[PDB]
């Protein structure tokens, strides 16, 4: 009975990476914060002092 | 995890502020120890066990 909806992941289609700087910056920024949210925190360090 | 043995070692040799010395040097310490023989006494027993 299983049924899903195709994700539709056609690539770039639009090449903004060659003029729309203004917006890339906004993307990068975004994708970046996104990243930090994931990058696991570290553990077992050497006592600062 | 050997960060264990080194610690005790140095301690038993008073003077040294164990806590007040990094994990570094410590490892390098192992690296040198690993290349050393054992005192017949010590060794001769482990073989037995």
Six token digits for residue A25 = 């910056």
Contacts of A49 in chain B (CB under 8 A): 20
CA angle A34, A38, A42 (to 5 degrees): 140
Please answer whether residues A27 and A34 qualify as being in contact, where contact means their C-beta atoms are separated by less than 8 angstroms: no
CB atoms within 10 A of CB A24: 13
Tally of CB atoms within 10 A around B30: 14
Nearest chain A residue to B23, by CA: A46
User: CA–CA separation, A47 vs A45, rounded Å?
Assistant: 6
Angle at B13 between CA B19 and CA B10, to 5 degrees: 45
- The alpha carbon of residue A46 is apart from the nearest alpha carbon of chain B, in Å, by 7
User: What's the reported resolution, in angstroms, to a tenth?
Assistant: 5.0
Please check whether residue A8 touches B, CB under 8 A. no
Tell me which method was used to determine the 3D structure.
X-ray
Buried b (16+ CB within 10 A) or exposed e, A36-45: eeeeeeeeee
Bin A43: left if φ > 0, else alpha if -120 < ψ < 50, else beta.
beta
Q: Which residue of A has its CA nearest to B19?
A: A47
């Amino acid at each position: 009975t299983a049924r899903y909806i195709r994700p539709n992941l056609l690539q770039d289609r639009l090449n903004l990476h060659d003029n729309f700087e203004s917006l890339w910056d906004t993307i990068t920024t975004s994708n970046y914060i996104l990243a930090r949210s994931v990058v696991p925190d570290l553990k077992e360090l050497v006592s600062t002092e | 995890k050997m960060k264990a043995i080194v610690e005790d070692f140095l301690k038993r040799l008073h003077i040294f502020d164990v806590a007040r010395v990094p994990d570094d040097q410590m490892y390098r310490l192992r690296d040198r120890l690993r290349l050393l023989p054992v005192e017949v006494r010590r060794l001769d027993i482990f073989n037995l066990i």
